[PDB]
Amino acid sequence: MKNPQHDASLLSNSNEFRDKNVEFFASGGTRTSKFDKLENHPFLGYPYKRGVKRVIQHYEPHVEAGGGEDLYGICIDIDEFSKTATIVPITNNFEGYLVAKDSTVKVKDKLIFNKDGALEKVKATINATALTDAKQISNEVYLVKVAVFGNK
Amino acid sequence: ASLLDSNFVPINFTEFVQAISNTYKQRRIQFYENLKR
Amino acid sequence: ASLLDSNFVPINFTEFVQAISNTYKQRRIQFYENLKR
Amino acid sequence: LFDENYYAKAVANIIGEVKDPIMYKWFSPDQIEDVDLQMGYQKTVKWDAFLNANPTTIANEVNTISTIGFSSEVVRLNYLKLQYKFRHLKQTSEKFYTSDSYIGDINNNLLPFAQAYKLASSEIIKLINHFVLTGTVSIQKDGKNQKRLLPNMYGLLNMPEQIKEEVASGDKDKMDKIFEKIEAGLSKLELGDEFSTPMMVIVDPATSLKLVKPYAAASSCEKWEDVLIQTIKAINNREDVYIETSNLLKHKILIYPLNSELIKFKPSKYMLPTPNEQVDKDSTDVAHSYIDFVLGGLLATRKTILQVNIKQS
Amino acid sequence: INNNLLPFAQAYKLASSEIIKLINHFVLTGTVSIQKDGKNQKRLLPNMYGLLNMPEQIKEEVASGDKDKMDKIFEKIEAGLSKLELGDEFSTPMMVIVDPATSLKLVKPYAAASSCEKWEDVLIQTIKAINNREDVYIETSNLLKHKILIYPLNSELIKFKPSKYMLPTPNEQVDKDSTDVAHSYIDFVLGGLLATRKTILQVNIKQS
Amino acid sequence: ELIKFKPSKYMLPTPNEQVDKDSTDVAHSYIDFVLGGLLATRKTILQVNIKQS
Amino acid sequence: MPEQIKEEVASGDKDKMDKIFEKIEAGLSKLELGDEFSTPMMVIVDPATSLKL
Amino acid sequence: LMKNPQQDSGLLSNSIDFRDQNLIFSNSGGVCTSSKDKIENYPAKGYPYKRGVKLSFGDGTTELEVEAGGGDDLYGVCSDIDEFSGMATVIPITNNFTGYLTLKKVNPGDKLNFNQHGELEKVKSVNAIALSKAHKLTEDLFIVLASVFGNRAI
Amino acid sequence: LMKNPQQDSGLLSNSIDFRDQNLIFSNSGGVCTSSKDKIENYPAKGYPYKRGVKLSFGDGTTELEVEAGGGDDLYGVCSDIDEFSGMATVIPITNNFTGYLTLKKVNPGDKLNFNQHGELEKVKSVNAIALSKAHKLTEDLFIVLASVFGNR
C-alpha cells in the first residue's frame, strides 16, 4: 500500500547511510521548497506516487490515477484514515521518485504519464525528465527519479 | 481554568485552547441549567 | 511456586502448569550458572 | 490436586529426569527472555532516517533544499501452539501388566504413563531444538513435507537478509577454499558499534574433522581452527570465540555474535512440553494423553549472521 | 507511525547522526555521495581534498591477478614506504587505515607459513624501519574499499583545520503553517585538510 | 441508553495559532473544528418524509 | 441514520393531516424502545407541519 | 471474503426479538451439532469458508492443503476458519453435517451437489438435501440450509 | 508376517536421528487419530494386519471372522493385531482413516483401490489417496501413507 515495513520479519541495520532512500515509504520529494502548493483531495483507488485526474459525477469531485490530456497533478502522500491524497498541481514543478511502467526507463529519457498514472518512455503533453534508471522494489513496482516542470 | 475566570492568565496557546474548550463546556452546562422545558 | 521445592502443593492444573514453567526457567538459570565455556 | 490426579503426580515426579535442551549452549544467558503468550504476536517499532539527495549549497538566494526522510518499521514475532497425543496404559491396569524387571506390554508396545510422557517430552524437545536451529519443522531426513508455519517465524539458519556464502561442489574437499568463503562472509558482516561481543560458531562433524589439519609446505604449529579463531577475533575485537559441533547440521557453518542487542530470543514461557488436563478413558486398559508446546520468537538484526553452505554435488 | 512523523528531538537526533556519517565519509574519502557506487557526486570547490584524493602523494596499484597475494601487496607497500619523503620530521608515529578484507588478510601467519609472526607484525616492523622505530597504529574502516592508507600523525606535515561550525548546527528559521507538520534546517561546513606533498601512501588493490 | 452524542471536546470552532502576514494591511486567520460522534440503537428513530411531488 | 424507521407520505396526500398522522401512527407502532420506554420524547417538525398541527 | 463482517458496524444492534437472528455469515458450525462428531483442521488455501473442500498437493516441500472444490474430489466441508493461523476446520464427508452453506448463484427437498468451486447447486455423487430456501446475504452471496450425508451410489 | 517379532540381540542400537523413525512395520494405529473414531475387534483368520478386511462366514458353527480382501467385499481396515488372542482391530469403512497400509509390489495424489488380497494398487469404489511414496520394509513388503474416506 504505502508502508510495507510494518510487516518486517527482522530489525533493520542503520549503520550504513548509502543506498537507503529508494523506498516506497519515501513520501514527498527529494528537494522541497516552502512555497510549493499542496492540495488535499478525496480519492478512490491507489493513486500513490502516480499522476492523477479529476473525476466529476451527488458528491464533490474526487481524484484517481490517470494521465494524458486529463492530467491534473501528482500525488505525493496519502492519509489512509481520512482517505485523502496530497497533490502538487501540474502548474508547480516537482522532483522525486514516481511509479514507472516498466524497467526500460533510462537517464535523460523523456517520460509521459499513461492512463494508469505510471511514467513511460515516449509529441508529448508534459515535460518530465528521468534523472535515474528505473529501480525495482516489488515484483511489479518500479520507481524512477523524475523532474516534472510543466506542460509542452 | 476557564475564560470565565478573569484571574486566569494563559501562558501559551495550548492553555488558551484548553480554556476555550472548558468555556464551551461550562456554557453548555449553564444553558442546560437555565433551560426550562 | 516451583516443583524443585517439595513443600509446594498445587491446588489445580493451572498452578501446576505455572509451576512447570517456573521449574523450566529455574533449570535454565541453573544450567547457565553451571556452564563453563 | 496430587491426591486426585495420578497423572499430574507422575508428571511432577518424572519431570526431573528430562534433560535440558541443547539450544541453550548456542545462546548467552542475556540473549533469552520469556514472554507470557501462547498463540499470537508481539510487535516492535523502530525508527530510521535516510538522506534523499545531496546536500544543498547555501549561496545567494535559494529556497529549494534537499530533504531528509524518516521511516518506521514494525517487526512482528508470531507464536504458535502445537499439540501431540500418545497412548499409554491405565494406572488401575498397570498391576496386570507389571513384569519381573519392567512394567508394560512389550508385544503391544504399551507403556506406563510416566515413561511414555518422558519419552514423548524428549522427542518434542529434540523437535524444538531442530526448529530453533534450522527454522523448519519436519520429520523426514529429506526435509520435505514440511509443516506450513506462520510468517515471521525463522531460525538461525533460514533467517532472511543475512550473509550467505556457497562453497562450490568441486571445492568441498578444499579447506582453503572453504576458509576463503568464510573470510569473505566475515568481511561482508556488519556488526556496527556493537562489534565488541563474544562470537559463536556452529559446525558440522565433517567440518570439525577438517579443522584439525595443519594450516597451509604445511604449518607445523598452527591449525585451521586457530586461524579461524584469530580471524573472528580480528572482527570481534579480540573477544571470546566459542566453537560447537552439532549433528543436526550437514555441511553448513553458522557464525553469529552472542549479543542481545543484535540477536534476541524471546520464547513463550510455555514453549517447552506441558501436559494437558484432558485424558481419554474407555472401558479398556488404554488411555490417551496430550502434550502442548509453543514455537516462535527469534529476532535478529540485518546482516549479522554468516551462513556458509558447502555444495555436496 | 502510519505517516512517518516524529517529534523534533528525535528527528534532529537522527538527522544529526546521518549528517555526521556523511561528514566522516567526506573527511576520509574527499568525495560527497549518497550512493554506494560513488556516482552522482556533488561538484566541490578546488583545494578541498581528503586523505584518499590528496594530490601529489605516493600512489601504488596492486594488479588484479595478485589481489590475493599478500607478498605482492607487501612488495608494493615497501616500494611506497621507500618512496615516502618525511624530511626532518621522520621521527613521528604513523597511522594505517585498511578495509575489512585487508584487515582479515593481515591476521594470517606470515608466509611455507612462519610461526610466531604475522603479516601485521611484518608491516609494523617495515613502517618502524622508516619512522625511527616510533609507534604504528592500525585502524579498520568499512568506508574504504580495497584501499590502504598510510600517513604520519605529525602536525608539522598533516594538519586538519576545520571550521568551528563543521558539525551539524540547527538553523533559526522554522517553517510553520495551519497543519501539524513543521520543517527545520541543519547546517554544516566541509573543508580544511592540509598536507605536505609526498607524505601520504595510498595503495589500491584492483579487483577487475 | 438508546441515543448518545460523544462529540470531541474540540468540536466547536477554535482559532489556530498560524496567522498569515504580509507587507499590506490584509492578514489571514484559520479556524478549526471537529465533526462526528453520534451513536444510536437500531429502530429507535422515526423519520416521516412528506413527498412534495 | 440507517436501520431506523422511515415513512413516506404520498404527494397527493401532502395536505391531508389525517394521512400524515396515520403514517406517524404506523412508525410509532414499528418503533422498538425495549425496556427503556419510560423516557421523554422529542419531536422536531418543519414550519408547514407546525402550521397544520 | 471474511468470516466476520469486514466493515465495523455504525450502530448498536437492537436486542429485542429472538426470531430470524441466525441468517448471518458469521454463524459458524452447525445448527444441530453432535458431541461425537469427528473434526479436523488443515492449512487453508484461499477462503474455503462454508464451502466443500478438496485435498491439494504441491511439489512436496510442504504438506498438503485444502482448497474449495467438489465433484469427484470432494473430501469434506469447511465450517470454520481461524484467520490468524490460516486454519480451516473440516468435517469429513464420512460424517453427516447439517448447516448453512454457500449456494451457487431452490426449494426444500431439492437434491444438491457440489460444483468445482465448492458451491451447492441443484441436480449425482454426494447426498445433499436443502432444508430451506436461499437467503441472500450479498448481491453475489447466497446461503442455504442443507444436510450432507455421505456419498450416494452411481 | 508378524507385527512385532521378538528376538534378543547382543548389542544395543543407537537412535542417532529422530526423523524417518516411524517407517516400521510395528507402528500400529493411525498417524493422526481422533478420540471419536469408532473401533471394533474381530477374530482374525490369516494375518490381515495393515490390510483391508472383508467378512468371512463359516458353516455356522463359529461366528463370522475377518480376512484380507477388498473389491466389493471391503468391510473395513485392520489397524492392529493382538496375537495372543488372535484379535484384529478394525476401523469400519464408514469411518475415515489415515495411516500406513500395505501396498501391492505410486506417487502422492494417485487414487488407490483395494485388491483381492487387501493391498493397495493404483487404479474404482474405495476412496484411497496416496499421501506419500512407497517405502520398502522387506523385499516383498511395501507400505504407503494413504487416506481412506469412504466410497464413491
Side-chain angles (χ1 to χ4, degrees):
Chain A
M1 297 297 103
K2 174 190 174 181
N3 292 1
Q5 305 304 119
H6 302 316
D7 202 59
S9 55
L10 73 164
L11 289 178
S12 66
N13 203 0
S14 57
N15 290 124
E16 185 53 60
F17 70 109
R18 289 163 297 181
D19 295 358
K20 200 184 180 183
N21 63 298
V22 189
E23 295 294 328
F24 211 58
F25 58 65
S27 47
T30 67
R31 300 164 44 185
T32 302
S33 170
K34 172 184 181 173
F35 308 119
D36 275 355
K37 184 166 180 175
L38 306 180
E39 290 186 354
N40 79 301
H41 292 114
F43 70 73
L44 294 174
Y46 303 115
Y48 184 56
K49 289 191 172 183
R50 311 210 172 189
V52 293
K53 58 181 173 182
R54 269 192 173 181
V55 180
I56 305 94
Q57 318 179 1
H58 185 241
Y59 286 113
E60 56 176 358
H62 72 73
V63 289
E64 76 182 1
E69 300 182 0
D70 299 359
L71 182 63
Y72 174 63
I74 304 167
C75 175
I76 69 174
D77 202 1
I78 293 171
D79 185 8
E80 300 183 0
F81 174 62
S82 62
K83 305 171 187 177
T84 58
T86 302
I87 298 179
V88 180
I90 194 66
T91 56
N92 189 358
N93 72 300
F94 173 70
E95 274 199 1
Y97 287 115
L98 292 187
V99 166
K101 178 183 177 184
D102 58 359
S103 57
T104 66
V105 181
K106 303 171 184 179
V107 182
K108 297 177 298 181
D109 293 1
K110 295 181 179 178
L111 301 188
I112 303 183
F113 284 111
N114 63 5
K115 297 185 176 181
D116 301 1
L119 281 162
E120 60 187 2
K121 187 173 184 176
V122 183
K123 71 163 196 304
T125 59
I126 63 170
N127 308 67
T129 298
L131 309 181
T132 62
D133 285 0
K135 304 148 182 181
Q136 180 177 0
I137 296 171
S138 179
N139 296 359
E140 303 179 0
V141 172
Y142 299 114
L143 294 177
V144 63
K145 189 172 182 174
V146 170
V148 185
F149 52 98
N151 63 22
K152 177 190 184 63
Chain B
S2 180
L3 292 181
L4 301 193
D5 307 356
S6 301
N7 282 1
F8 161 65
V9 178
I11 307 174
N12 47 63
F13 206 70
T14 298
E15 302 178 2
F16 178 57
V17 171
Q18 296 298 300
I20 293 183
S21 305
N22 299 0
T23 302
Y24 279 127
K25 180 174 183 175
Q26 294 178 1
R27 291 224 294 178
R28 179 218 317 173
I29 306 171
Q30 181 184 1
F31 164 69
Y32 279 125
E33 298 162 357
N34 299 358
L35 170 79
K36 28 190 177 180
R37 299 176 175 295
Chain C
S2 178
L3 304 186
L4 297 201
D5 306 0
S6 298
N7 303 358
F8 166 62
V9 176
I11 310 180
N12 45 61
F13 206 69
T14 286
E15 299 182 1
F16 180 57
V17 173
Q18 310 309 300
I20 296 177
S21 305
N22 306 353
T23 303
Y24 272 125
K25 179 182 181 181
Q26 293 175 2
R27 296 203 305 175
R28 185 181 68 190
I29 305 176
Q30 184 175 359
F31 167 69
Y32 283 123
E33 296 163 358
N34 291 318
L35 172 73
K36 42 163 188 177
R37 313 167 179 292
Chain D
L1 169 74
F2 284 0
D3 296 357
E4 296 190 359
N5 194 358
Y6 153 75
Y7 303 117
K9 195 170 184 179
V11 166
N13 303 1
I14 196 67
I15 197 65
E17 314 188 1
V18 184
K19 292 188 172 183
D20 297 359
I22 70 182
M23 65 182 179
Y24 291 173
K25 313 168 57 180
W26 309 334
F27 293 115
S28 67
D30 211 2
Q31 279 180 299
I32 307 187
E33 291 197 1
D34 285 359
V35 290
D36 192 1
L37 165 80
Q38 279 187 357
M39 185 179 288
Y41 67 79
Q42 297 293 321
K43 286 186 175 181
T44 299
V45 178
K46 179 170 182 174
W47 284 102
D48 190 359
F50 45 99
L51 307 183
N52 296 301
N54 293 303
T56 295
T57 298
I58 306 304
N60 289 358
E61 298 179 58
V62 64
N63 46 58
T64 312
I65 307 178
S66 295
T67 60
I68 299 178
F70 303 80
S71 63
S72 51
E73 61 166 359
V74 176
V75 183
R76 176 168 159 177
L77 284 188
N78 286 354
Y79 300 71
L80 184 68
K81 191 175 185 177
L82 301 179
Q83 197 184 243
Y84 267 120
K85 185 212 303 180
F86 62 107
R87 54 184 292 181
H88 55 112
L89 290 170
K90 189 162 38 56
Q91 185 258 359
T92 67
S93 70
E94 290 168 0
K95 59 180 65 176
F96 311 116
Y97 287 111
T98 57
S99 181
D100 186 74
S101 296
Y102 64 100
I103 311 181
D105 186 0
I106 297 170
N107 308 298
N108 292 302
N109 298 302
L110 269 173
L111 276 67
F113 170 69
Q115 315 307 302
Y117 177 70
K118 173 188 175 180
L119 299 190
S121 306
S122 302
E123 286 304 300
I124 299 180
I125 296 190
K126 302 179 179 180
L127 184 70
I128 298 178
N129 295 352
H130 188 66
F131 169 65
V132 179
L133 183 76
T134 66
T136 65
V137 172
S138 179
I139 65 170
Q140 295 183 358
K141 293 179 180 179
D142 199 0
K144 296 184 177 177
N145 199 59
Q146 283 182 0
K147 183 178 183 60
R148 197 188 71 179
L149 296 184
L150 305 185
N152 299 358
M153 275 179 81
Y154 296 111
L156 290 171
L157 192 60
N158 69 351
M159 185 66 78
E161 303 305 301
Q162 306 284 355
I163 295 90
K164 302 185 182 184
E165 302 283 357
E166 180 171 359
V167 181
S169 54
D171 297 357
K172 58 191 167 188
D173 287 1
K174 318 174 185 180
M175 173 69 217
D176 50 359
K177 290 295 187 174
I178 305 176
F179 204 107
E180 165 195 0
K181 295 298 179 177
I182 302 176
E183 185 181 0
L186 283 183
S187 73
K188 302 170 186 178
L189 281 167
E190 304 164 0
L191 303 191
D193 294 1
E194 289 282 355
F195 68 115
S196 177
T197 177
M199 296 277 309
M200 164 65 77
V201 181
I202 308 182
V203 296
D204 47 294
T207 298
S208 183
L209 297 190
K210 301 182 181 179
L211 285 185
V212 299
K213 308 169 184 175
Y215 171 63
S219 305
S220 58
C221 306
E222 306 189 1
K223 288 77 185 181
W224 282 106
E225 171 184 359
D226 291 331
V227 179
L228 182 72
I229 300 181
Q230 300 310 300
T231 309
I232 304 174
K233 273 184 177 298
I235 76 175
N236 75 358
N237 192 57
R238 300 182 177 181
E239 287 275 0
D240 298 0
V241 176
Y242 311 118
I243 308 186
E244 295 274 359
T245 311
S246 178
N247 50 358
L248 305 187
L249 284 194
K250 292 204 305 175
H251 307 117
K252 295 191 175 186
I253 310 174
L254 267 183
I255 310 184
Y256 60 88
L258 292 189
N259 193 359
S260 63
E261 304 285 359
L262 299 186
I263 303 179
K264 194 145 191 175
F265 181 53
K266 302 175 178 178
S268 163
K269 50 176 298 182
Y270 312 115
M271 156 180 71
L272 290 192
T274 302
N276 195 359
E277 197 178 0
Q278 165 75 3
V279 176
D280 300 357
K281 298 175 181 177
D282 293 1
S283 57
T284 71
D285 290 357
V286 184
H288 299 68
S289 288
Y290 306 81
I291 305 185
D292 307 302
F293 63 94
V294 176
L295 287 193
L298 191 57
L299 179 66
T301 44
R302 285 192 168 181
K303 296 168 180 177
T304 47
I305 305 178
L306 167 64
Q307 312 170 358
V308 184
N309 165 57
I310 317 173
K311 193 177 190 177
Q312 292 300 121
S313 295
Chain E
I1 296 184
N2 308 300
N3 287 301
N4 305 301
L5 274 161
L6 298 89
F8 174 68
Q10 321 291 357
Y12 181 71
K13 180 197 298 179
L14 293 193
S16 300
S17 300
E18 291 297 300
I19 299 179
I20 294 188
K21 303 179 180 182
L22 186 71
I23 297 175
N24 293 352
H25 182 65
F26 173 65
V27 176
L28 184 73
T29 67
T31 61
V32 179
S33 181
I34 63 173
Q35 297 185 358
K36 188 173 183 178
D37 300 1
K39 299 186 178 183
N40 267 0
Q41 286 180 359
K42 192 182 199 311
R43 191 179 66 181
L44 303 178
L45 298 188
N47 300 61
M48 269 175 80
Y49 303 109
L51 292 169
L52 198 72
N53 64 353
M54 183 67 76
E56 303 174 62
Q57 304 303 302
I58 297 90
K59 303 182 60 175
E60 300 282 356
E61 187 169 0
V62 186
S64 61
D66 298 358
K67 54 183 302 301
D68 295 358
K69 308 181 182 181
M70 211 57 222
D71 54 298
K72 301 292 188 176
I73 302 180
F74 269 59
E75 184 178 1
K76 295 295 183 178
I77 297 176
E78 298 157 1
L81 285 188
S82 75
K83 302 171 186 177
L84 280 188
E85 305 179 0
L86 305 193
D88 213 0
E89 305 284 356
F90 66 115
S91 179
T92 176
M94 297 282 304
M95 166 63 73
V96 182
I97 307 178
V98 294
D99 54 297
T102 297
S103 181
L104 295 190
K105 290 187 176 181
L106 288 186
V107 298
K108 303 311 187 65
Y110 168 62
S114 306
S115 306
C116 302
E117 198 173 3
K118 313 167 186 175
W119 284 103
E120 174 187 0
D121 308 300
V122 176
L123 184 74
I124 298 180
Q125 301 165 1
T126 310
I127 305 177
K128 279 178 175 294
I130 77 176
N131 73 357
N132 209 4
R133 277 82 183 180
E134 278 274 358
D135 301 359
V136 176
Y137 306 116
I138 308 186
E139 295 292 302
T140 303
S141 185
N142 55 0
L143 305 183
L144 279 196
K145 190 192 313 171
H146 315 122
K147 297 284 187 175
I148 306 179
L149 192 76
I150 313 177
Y151 57 98
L153 287 189
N154 185 4
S155 62
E156 302 301 300
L157 296 185
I158 302 180
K159 200 171 188 181
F160 186 48
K161 300 178 181 181
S163 160
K164 52 177 299 183
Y165 311 114
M166 150 182 70
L167 293 192
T169 297
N171 190 296
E172 194 178 1
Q173 171 73 6
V174 173
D175 297 0
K176 296 173 183 180
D177 57 356
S178 54
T179 74
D180 291 359
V181 179
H183 294 66
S184 289
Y185 303 76
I186 304 183
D187 298 298
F188 60 113
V189 174
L190 291 192
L193 185 63
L194 168 61
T196 61
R197 65 178 49 181
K198 294 177 183 178
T199 56
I200 309 177
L201 169 62
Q202 174 193 0
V203 185
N204 169 57
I205 310 94
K206 186 170 185 56
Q207 280 61 53
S208 302
Chain F
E1 314 287 356
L2 299 183
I3 308 182
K4 191 166 188 181
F5 188 45
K6 295 185 177 182
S8 169
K9 52 175 303 185
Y10 313 115
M11 155 181 70
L12 287 192
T14 302
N16 194 358
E17 195 173 0
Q18 169 73 5
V19 173
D20 299 357
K21 300 178 179 183
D22 203 3
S23 65
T24 66
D25 296 356
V26 191
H28 298 69
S29 288
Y30 302 79
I31 305 179
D32 316 299
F33 58 112
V34 176
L35 277 196
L38 190 66
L39 177 63
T41 49
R42 304 194 168 184
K43 299 164 185 175
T44 52
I45 302 179
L46 170 58
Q47 319 171 1
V48 183
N49 166 61
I50 318 175
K51 210 184 188 184
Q52 301 296 300
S53 297
Chain G
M1 187 69 83
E3 309 291 295
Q4 307 284 356
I5 298 98
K6 299 185 181 183
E7 304 278 357
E8 181 188 0
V9 184
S11 58
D13 295 359
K14 69 188 174 185
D15 290 357
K16 309 180 181 180
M17 185 61 215
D18 54 357
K19 307 304 176 182
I20 305 177
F21 185 76
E22 161 186 359
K23 293 297 182 174
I24 301 175
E25 294 173 59
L28 280 179
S29 77
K30 306 175 184 177
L31 275 170
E32 304 173 0
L33 303 191
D35 296 0
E36 299 285 357
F37 62 92
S38 184
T39 180
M41 298 284 308
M42 167 67 72
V43 185
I44 312 182
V45 291
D46 74 297
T49 295
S50 186
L51 287 191
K52 301 172 180 174
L53 285 185
Chain H
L1 293 191
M2 185 177 282
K3 167 184 172 179
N4 197 62
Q6 316 171 301
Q7 306 183 0
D8 306 352
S9 58
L11 289 95
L12 284 179
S13 63
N14 205 354
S15 49
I16 303 299
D17 202 3
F18 63 107
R19 297 191 303 296
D20 289 356
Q21 281 200 358
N22 63 298
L23 292 185
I24 64 178
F25 202 57
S26 189
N27 188 3
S28 64
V31 288
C32 295
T33 301
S34 170
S35 57
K36 305 303 161 52
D37 281 355
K38 175 166 185 175
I39 306 173
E40 320 178 0
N41 62 356
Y42 275 113
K45 177 180 182 177
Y47 211 65
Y49 188 58
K50 291 180 169 301
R51 288 200 171 183
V53 296
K54 50 181 172 177
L55 294 194
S56 54
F57 307 74
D59 196 2
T61 307
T62 62
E63 54 184 358
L64 64 94
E65 301 172 0
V66 297
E67 55 178 359
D72 301 358
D73 302 301
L74 189 71
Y75 170 70
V77 293
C78 185
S79 62
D80 201 359
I81 292 191
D82 185 6
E83 302 171 0
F84 174 63
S85 66
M87 280 305 111
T89 299
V90 173
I91 302 181
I93 197 56
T94 65
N95 185 3
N96 75 298
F97 169 69
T98 307
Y100 286 108
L101 289 184
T102 300
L103 179 81
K104 167 190 175 184
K105 178 179 184 178
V106 172
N107 302 303
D110 289 359
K111 298 187 179 184
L112 307 181
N113 61 296
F114 276 115
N115 62 4
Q116 293 184 358
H117 326 303
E119 313 176 301
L120 277 177
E121 52 177 359
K122 186 175 178 180
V123 178
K124 52 170 190 183
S125 60
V126 185
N127 269 352
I129 295 183
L131 305 187
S132 75
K133 300 178 181 177
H135 312 294
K136 171 178 172 178
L137 298 195
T138 301
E139 301 279 356
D140 298 359
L141 178 67
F142 302 68
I143 57 176
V144 57
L145 180 67
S147 296
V148 184
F149 45 101
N151 289 355
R152 82 156 200 179
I154 317 180
Chain I
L1 268 190
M2 292 177 72
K3 163 190 173 305
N4 187 56
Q6 295 184 300
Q7 272 192 1
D8 303 358
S9 57
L11 276 194
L12 288 187
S13 59
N14 194 4
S15 52
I16 61 182
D17 199 2
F18 74 110
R19 308 191 291 293
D20 278 357
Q21 185 178 2
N22 61 305
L23 301 173
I24 56 186
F25 200 55
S26 63
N27 189 2
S28 65
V31 293
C32 191
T33 304
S34 172
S35 55
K36 309 298 160 50
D37 280 356
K38 181 176 187 179
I39 297 175
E40 299 169 357
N41 55 355
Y42 294 73
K45 180 171 54 174
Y47 211 65
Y49 182 58
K50 293 316 182 187
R51 283 197 174 183
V53 293
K54 57 174 177 179
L55 286 200
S56 53
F57 295 66
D59 209 0
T61 305
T62 70
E63 54 182 359
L64 62 95
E65 297 185 359
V66 287
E67 51 172 356
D72 306 359
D73 306 299
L74 185 83
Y75 173 66
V77 164
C78 177
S79 56
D80 202 2
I81 282 188
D82 183 3
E83 302 200 1
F84 172 65
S85 54
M87 285 304 109
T89 288
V90 174
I91 303 177
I93 190 58
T94 64
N95 186 4
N96 72 301
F97 173 68
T98 313
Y100 289 106
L101 292 183
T102 305
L103 179 80
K104 171 187 175 181
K105 171 178 185 179
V106 173
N107 301 299
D110 302 358
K111 295 191 177 181
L112 305 185
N113 66 299
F114 277 112
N115 67 358
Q116 301 181 0
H117 324 304
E119 313 168 300
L120 283 174
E121 56 183 0
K122 190 168 181 173
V123 173
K124 38 174 185 180
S125 57
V126 177
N127 304 2
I129 292 188
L131 296 199
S132 73
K133 305 177 183 177
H135 312 293
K136 178 187 173 181
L137 307 191
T138 301
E139 293 284 355
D140 298 359
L141 184 65
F142 292 65
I143 67 174
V144 60
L145 186 64
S147 285
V148 186
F149 60 94
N151 282 1
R152 290 187 295 272

